[PDB]
Design a protein around this ligand. Structure first.
Ligand code: HEM
Ligand code: HEM
Ligand SMILES: Cn1c(=O)c2c(ncn2C)n(C)c1=O
Ligand SMILES: Cn1c(=O)c2c(ncn2C)n(C)c1=O
Ligand SMILES: Cn1c(=O)c2c(ncn2C)n(C)c1=O
Ligand SMILES: Cn1c(=O)c2c(ncn2C)n(C)c1=O
Ligand SMILES: Cn1c(=O)c2c(ncn2C)n(C)c1=O
Ligand SMILES: Cn1c(=O)c2c(ncn2C)n(C)c1=O
Ligand SMILES: Cn1c(=O)c2c(ncn2C)n(C)c1=O
Ligand SMILES: Cn1c(=O)c2c(ncn2C)n(C)c1=O
Ligand SMILES: Cn1c(=O)c2c(ncn2C)n(C)c1=O
Ligand SMILES: Cn1c(=O)c2c(ncn2C)n(C)c1=O
Ligand SMILES: Cn1c(=O)c2c(ncn2C)n(C)c1=O
Ligand SMILES: Cn1c(=O)c2c(ncn2C)n(C)c1=O
Lengths: 468, 468
């Protein structure tokens, strides 16, 4: 069982000594972030470890990161770490490899332009108003408020309407078929027993694929495949009600070099957009409101900036959202402290030599975002929430390969601008109406989960008083 | 279990209807050759079938075959069908894929030039003399002679001396450690229960690789890895006795673009050369002596040609072997009737469109050599042994993509000239001394095995009388 455990020694690369069969997974007992921080302060700029038999090489040099993420992306570092069983979701752009990905990224790029986003802003803002009416019902009743519930329902409303044109107040329709299914698309905890078992027994993945066992649950995928079918037909009939959702943008793409999106590929992308945006958006928004509640000074200044740009609670628009600097600064600093990706990864497909370091075929090159976002070498007082880092005066010292909450290069986050616009639109409408103060039962300082997802240990609960 | 069984229907390609899970493997009850002949006369120029879930596309068009074997070899049809578990023998040139193969083929090409073969001919001829002394011991005693025994011992003697410099009369040293180990390298019967099981459960191959279970038996591979080690050291010490074996040619290659052969790669090639030459050479030589014994006219003419070129039983040399035309004609016609490969195969690595036919990614493109060698469209009276086909007058009508006993293109047989020279050298020395006549217990007509290897059903036994 000590087959490949000798790689990093032959190359002279340091790291924690692995155990037979297990590799270094027992060190994940405090999550990915704490393991990366510990390895960083312990072994320096580069180190190696083993997820079972799989070797992983961590890199922290911003010149080296640029070579992996940008310069040699097509040639060597094109794909992410394999995982499964994935079934047909192999066709999702985030999972596809080599030429299949390059084609899918080429097909989906016009869907995420600033023009299509501009046409989605009125839809997103509608549920910012819905978010305020539900927040006010929990504010006129003096009761502590679980953020991820009210931000989860907001993210759900934005997803259903901007990806399928389905318009629901999901907080008050918890058993609409579209809401209960979409709510089941929970992010993967790679440290739970099932995924840790697969990590230790990767040879069992082909056995699960032949039995049609899938990490994306069949019941939800079957419901969306048929729902897309019914919408693709009905949209052909009533063809006067113009739509501006991802489904409609992808339906149109099939009406043109590359092959057009197949009907199954189209479903795969629609599903992966939900996974990408649903718990991510609500998690970040909760992190933001925590930092705003623990720093009343920052919250007031943002509320003053919003009222200067949008007097009299004027509705946020596309151009006015991008106008607010302190809002962008608050969002960025919160993502520095809580980069929910935790890591960026690329599989080394060829025996390569970059920046003087030899990297052999099969190694997973990893960029530890959570650690680099808190590295004293680039951030003074990294544990403190200080949005002034991202002011126009100081944003020249921020290295774009140390700060990668959306990745970088050709395979970065394709929904970055959408996610930023979505979160800011929510933040503006919420702060125009409310202020957020800690409870007695608020966890200060916030503690992170020991699991495989960057989320609070306990839910963030805050008191919400109206600005009336 | 009927997952991929719908491919050839969507493409409109005919073939036998597959069963769930099994595919079409139950049709292998008469071997590969009879299944290919039956499918050819039944479905035409192109057909498809399933080895379990694996789709296989058979092609018979010589223009299409050239595109697969030659024109699009590097781009699309580079590798052979995956099989396992293979362990470290993944590094053998016949098993390696993509850039690994292209490098290994580049490293091994100078080893198989006509110059290195010219320097090996004296060694090979030595055991042609040994073959005659052992044949005569079985001829002065009137007793029927099993060909594959006396040709197996000859092929063994040629292999040990031309690949390792180990010089043994293996027929009379059956328990030299080098002889009993090398004799265990038996060709793979892909129709025996184990390989048929792997075909039906290909998802179990990763489970066997993690347990170091290997189709190349460990005991023999361990013996040769250490034997090569001891020879690589001892050859460095006594460095005046010049050697002309494959091991010495590959030892020298490590003393130079590409990376040099590693010590493990070098062992992998040495092993695969034995698999390639051991039972193949003795099988063909047996087939040749059968056709010569069933056609006394052809045998006398060849004996007269040999005596005209080499009067007084003169020893065959490099230039005199290539001089004999009827010898080349006899060898070729026997390989037409018995192309021990049976099939050539290439995996389709990309969605391609060649000669008007669309071929999708993952399909195994197969060229049925045994069937094309007996196709009435190109061979008049194909079931009859008629060496005049390969005379200089008639060799203009022979299509090099219908007649492929050594394959074709960049990935053809690299030891073709060696194998032809080895077999002819044996044939000359044998026919200079003996004549071969059928027994009562000789199977006339010869019947083929129902297994996965092109070999006689019963051993070819012939009477051997001396030409004294
Ligand atoms: C706060 C919200 C989000 C964050 C922090 C985030 C972050 C990230 C990160 C770090 C990556 C990997 C980048 C890399 O490997 O270099 C990624 C990939 C991706 N994201 Fe986002 N994301 C968010 C929301 C979204 C949304 C709303 C979408 C909507 C479509 C989306 C679509 C994608 C896709 C498709 C990929 C894979 C791109 C590819 O493989 O080519 N993400 N995201
Ligand atoms: C009567 C004897 C032999 C016959 C009929 C024969 C036939 C063949 C055939 C049909 C192929 C596949 C060609 C293709 O896929 O297009 C092949 C491949 C090969 N043969 Fe031979 N062979 C013989 C003996 C030998 C010998 C003595 C060697 C000694 C080294 C050898 C070395 C190889 C190798 C290395 C390959 C794989 C080439 C590659 O994958 O690049 N063979 N042979
Ligand atoms: C720890 N880990 C990951 O973090 C991971 C993964 N596949 C994708 N990711 C992100 N696998 C298999 C894994 O073991
Ligand atoms: C955390 N995580 C992953 O790490 C992941 C994923 N899909 C693929 N991967 C690798 N999803 C949906 C996810 O939530
Ligand atoms: C616990 N668990 C999972 O977490 C899981 C799964 N299939 C996919 N996932 C993610 N199965 C079968 C499972 O038992
Ligand atoms: C948590 N979980 C899953 O997430 C899961 C599953 N089977 C499939 N999936 C996706 N099982 C049994 C499960 O317990
Ligand atoms: C880190 N990460 C990814 O790696 C990712 C993604 N969507 C697709 N991928 C691959 N999202 C939302 C994400 O946060
Ligand atoms: C939240 N999230 C995702 O949603 C995700 C992912 N990889 C793929 N996806 C979709 N990773 C690493 C992730 O953290
Ligand atoms: C029938 N068959 C072959 O003929 C074969 C093979 N791998 C190589 N060959 C030649 N496999 C897996 C196979 O099933
Ligand atoms: C018949 N046969 C094969 O079909 C084969 C092989 N090695 C690999 N393959 C595919 N050997 C040694 C073999 O004898
Ligand atoms: C019958 N048989 C084989 O034929 C075989 C094998 N491993 C490799 N081969 C070829 N095992 C384990 C086996 O039982
Ligand atoms: C015939 N055979 C093999 O050829 C073999 C094996 N184990 C490994 N090999 C290669 N066993 C058990 C076996 O019966
Ligand atoms: C058909 N065939 C092959 O396919 C082959 C081989 N040696 C290597 N390969 C791949 N030999 C001797 C062979 O006869
Ligand atoms: C005899 N033989 C081999 O020796 C061989 C092979 N494929 C690889 N090898 C080595 N095939 C198909 C084969 O028939």
């Amino acid at each position: 069982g000590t087959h490949s455990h000798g790689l990093f020694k032959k190359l002279g690369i340091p790291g924690p000594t692995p155990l037979p069969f297990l590799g270094n997974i027992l060190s994940y007992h405090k999550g990915f972030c704490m393991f990366d921080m510990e390895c960083h302060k312990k072994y320096g700029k580069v180190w190696g470890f083993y997820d079972g038999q799989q070797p992983v090489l961590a890199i922290t040099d911003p010149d080296m990161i640029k070579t992996v993420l940008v310069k040699e992306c097509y040639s060597v570092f094109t794909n992410r770490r394999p995982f499964g069983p994935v079934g047909f979701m192999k066709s999702a752009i985030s999972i596809a490899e080599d030429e299949e990905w390059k084609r899918l990224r080429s097909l989906l790029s016009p869907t995420f332009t600033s023009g299509k986003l501009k046409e989605m802003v009125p839809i997103i803002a509608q549920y910012g108003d819905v978010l305020v009416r539900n927040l006010r019902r929990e504010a006129e009743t003096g009761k502590p408020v679980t953020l991820k519930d009210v931000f989860g329902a907001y993210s759900m409303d934005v997803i259903t309407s901007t990806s399928f044109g389905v318009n629901i107040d999901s907080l008050n329709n918890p058993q609409d078929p579209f809401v209960e299914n979409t709510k089941k698309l929970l992010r993967f905890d790679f440290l739970d027993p099932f995924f840790l078992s697969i990590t230790v027994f990767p040879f069992l993945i082909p056995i699960l694929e032949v039995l049609n066992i899938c990490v994306f649950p069949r019941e939800v995928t079957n419901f969306l495949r048929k729902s897309v079918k019914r919408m693709k037909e009905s949209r052909l009939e009533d063809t006067q009600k113009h739509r501006v959702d991802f489904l409609q943008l992808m339906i149109d793409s099939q009406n043109s070099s590359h092959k057009a999106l197949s009907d199954l590929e189209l479903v795969a992308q629609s599903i992966i957009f939900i996974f990408a945006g649903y718990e991510t958006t609500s998690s970040v928004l909760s992190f933001i409101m925590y930092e705003l509640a623990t720093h009343p000074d920052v919250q007031q200044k943002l509320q003053e900036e919003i009222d200067a740009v949008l007097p009299n609670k004027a509705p946020p628009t596309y151009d006015t959202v991008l106008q607010m600097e302190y809002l962008d600064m608050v969002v960025n600093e919160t993502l520095r402290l809580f980069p929910i990706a935790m890591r960026l990864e690329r599989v080394c497909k060829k025996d390569v030599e970059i920046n003087g370091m030899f990297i052999p075929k099969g190694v997973v090159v990893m960029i530890p975002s959570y650690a680099l976002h808190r590295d004293p070498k680039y951030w003074t007082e990294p544990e403190k929430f200080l949005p002034e880092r991202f002011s126009k005066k100081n944003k020249d010292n921020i290295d774009p390969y140390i700060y990668t909450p959306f990745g970088s290069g050709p395979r970065n986050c394709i929904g970055m601008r959408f996610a930023l616009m979505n979160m800011k639109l929510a933040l503006i409408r919420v702060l125009q109406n409310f202020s957020f103060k800690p409870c007695k039962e608020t966890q200060i300082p916030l503690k992170l989960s020991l699991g495989g997802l960057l989320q609070p240990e306990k839910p963030v609960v805050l008191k919400v008083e109206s600005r009336d």
